[PDB]
Design an enzyme around this catalytic site. Structure first.
Site, PDB file in Angstrom:
ATOM      1  N   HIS A 188       0.736  -1.208   0.059  1.00 55.15           N
ATOM      2  CA  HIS A 188       0.205   0.085   0.052  1.00 55.15           C
ATOM      3  C   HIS A 188       0.909   1.262  -0.153  1.00 55.15           C
ATOM      4  O   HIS A 188       0.207   2.372  -0.122  1.00 55.15           O
ATOM      5  CB  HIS A 188      -1.058  -0.148   1.226  1.00 55.15           C
TER       6      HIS A 188
ATOM      7  N   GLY B 100       3.953   5.308  10.744  1.00 51.63           N
ATOM      8  CA  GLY B 100       5.348   5.176  10.050  1.00 51.63           C
ATOM      9  C   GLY B 100       5.945   3.907  10.194  1.00 51.63           C
ATOM     10  O   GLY B 100       7.080   3.711   9.877  1.00 51.63           O
TER      11      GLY B 100
ATOM     12  N   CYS C 171       4.748   0.626   9.506  1.00 50.29           N
ATOM     13  CA  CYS C 171       4.624  -0.248   8.382  1.00 50.29           C
ATOM     14  C   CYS C 171       5.791  -0.677   7.628  1.00 50.29           C
ATOM     15  O   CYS C 171       6.651   0.366   7.506  1.00 50.29           O
ATOM     16  CB  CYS C 171       3.508   0.259   7.326  1.00 50.29           C
TER      17      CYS C 171
END
Ligand SMILES: COc1cccc2[nH]c(C(=O)N[C@@H](CC(C)C)C(=O)N[C@@H](C[C@@H]3CCNC3=O)C(=O)COP(=O)(O)O)cc12
Ligand SMILES: COc1cccc2[nH]c(C(=O)N[C@@H](CC(C)C)C(=O)N[C@@H](C[C@@H]3CCNC3=O)C(=O)COP(=O)(O)O)cc12
Lengths: 299, 298
Positions: free
Chosen positions: B39, B141, B143
């Site tokens: 993503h 932040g 991920c």
């Protein structure tokens, strides 16, 4: 919210093993000096009450085997600073990070890199108790493992491991070889003083709860620092210092709750109990998160 | 006896930053490939129902900004494996450890290296819950942060972070891009199935408490495996298999308390509560230590 250690790679690159005779312990290799506990020079029978200055006079540079992995680092100098041995070696560690040596205060937390024969085994976060003990996890061969904090790629070394008390807790020195607390590096049962609850960390935890919207325990009273300190000691809580009030500043500002109002809120909790209610899911007040820990996990 | 993670240095040397548009997150650099959550290609609009293969074909190699420290790596290829984007770069990572990609079973533990902007921030231990969430500590932040185990200088990657549920627990994928659990990488509020407690891990931890000289919970009684499992299931504990019993063998041999003896202890603690007492400092029955976890530390 959970107990989180710093990444251990900058300290992993500095771990070596130091052997004297058959005694092997861990050491810390920064630039061209290796730091390790001085009792590596002891025999099993020299340990009950050793004459370290006498023991060291007999030793020579070539009585010391320093190994990074299986690679030998030739020892070209040696001196004793308090309870730590300083071995000058012939190679500057290329993996040396920016570093400082710091002596921490009770309450402050740090990460421990548990090592055996110079090889890292695990990393976890500890708090320095008010009786200068840590609740660690160490086996035989762990001595010389270090504890540290990292502030912007700079590694602040604060602890080197020496001893397990009969109660199961652990004791050790700063990197200048000064013990935390009233212990000595001898093979002898020592007891720590009675421990207390780390008030500054409990307050941080209450701030953490408020930040997360758990705030029933806030009341409408305040208190002076001295009045709070006197009440705290009757509940086995540490008195607060001016520095404790200062490191709560950020959380105080972020929540808009004055430090002395949060103390009056804690004070009521101590005199009245939780009354079957919880804070951040728990019935017990957590005391091993510093204000910095809380800020780190919220920002 | 505390929760201890593997040393993280072999993984720290693999963390990079990946930027596509105005989305930044972490990636894992092994040899000449960088793995990150897909993503990172999504915009604010796409997040609600992103057709990922469609969105990926419209991206170019030069849309991806990969930074390793301050140096920038040039993407020379890109593909998708489920929810994981694979970015080929022209430079091999010298710090690539010996590594494997594994999918853990529920109840197994791993170490999490929390990273922000490709920079490692903290390390701690998690367990894959039976409802396939993990109880981690992750902010915006994070991920692309990964979970891993280490066995004889081989790092087994098992987790890449994607999501925080409304209840505050966390979800992600293995390194093949497959989610643990029924979760999906869209910007929606998702609930997990009802969680249960990892029984074999609670028993291991009770064995750990005895090894460290705490015995106040034991008792004289014993129980059959099935009678234990009836009570366990009533309290939403996972059932205990004969493999679990064997896995606990070493701890049983070391302490001299038979497994089904410890089960009677646990059964009493579940029926009677903890009555204000604590075990290894905890007010609650702890289930994020596997048998091997206890052994490795003890
Ligand atoms: C004096 O009689 C006692 C009675 C009751 C309790 C006692 N405890 C100690 C003690 O702690 N002694 C130090 C050595 C002295 C000279 C300071 C030690 O044993 N340190 C370990 C780490 C320890 C090992 C297990 N868990 C750890 O934390 C090393 O690592 C170095 O020794 P090793 O050569 O590696 O085994 C002595 C003692
Ligand atoms: C309406 O929708 C919702 C409702 C209720 C709860 C919800 N939760 C999420 C969610 O978690 N969404 C993922 C992205 C989707 C596309 C899978 C996300 O936000 N992941 C974070 C890590 C997270 C962020 C905070 N703590 C973490 O663990 C990244 O790191 C990447 O996002 P950033 O670029 O850093 O902002 C959406 C949502």
């Amino acid at each position: 919210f959970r107990k989180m250690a710093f990444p251990s790679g900058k300290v992993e690159g500095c771990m070596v093993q130091v052997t004297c005779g058959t005694t092997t312990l861990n050491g810390l290799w920064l630039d061209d000096v290796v730091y390790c506990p001085r009792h590596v020079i002891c025999t099993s029978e020299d340990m009950l009450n050793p004459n370290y200055e006498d023991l060291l006079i007999r030793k020579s540079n070539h009585n010391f085997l320093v190994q990074a992995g299986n690679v030998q680092l030739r020892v070209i100098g040696h001196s004793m600073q308090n309870c730590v041995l300083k071995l000058r070696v012939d190679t500057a560690n290329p993996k040396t990070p920016k570093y400082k040596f710091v002596r921490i205060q009770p309450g402050q937390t740090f990460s421990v890199l548990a090592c055996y024969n110079g090889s890292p085994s695990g990393v976890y976060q500890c708090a320095m108790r008010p009786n200068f003990t840590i609740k660690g996890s160490f086996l035989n061969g762990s001595c010389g493992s270090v504890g540290f904090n990292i502030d912007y790629d700079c590694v602040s070394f604060c602890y080197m491991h020496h001893m397990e008390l009969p109660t199961g807790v652990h004791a050790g020195t700063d990197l200048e070889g000064n013990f935390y607390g009233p212990f000595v590096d001898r093979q002898t049962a020592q007891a720590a003083g009675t421990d207390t609850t780390i008030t500054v960390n409990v307050l941080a935890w209450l701030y953490a709860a408020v930040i997360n919207g758990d705030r029933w325990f806030l009341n409408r009273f305040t208190t002076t620092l001295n009045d709070f300190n006197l009440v705290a000691m009757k509940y086995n809580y540490e008195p607060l210092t001016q520095d404790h009030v200062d490191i709560l500043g950020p959380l105080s500002a972020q929540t808009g709750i004055a430090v002395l109002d949060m103390c009056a809120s804690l004070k009521e909790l101590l005199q009245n109990g939780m009354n079957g209610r919880t804070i951040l899911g728990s019935a017990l007040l957590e005391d091993e998160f510093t204000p910095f820990d809380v800020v780190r996990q919220c920002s």
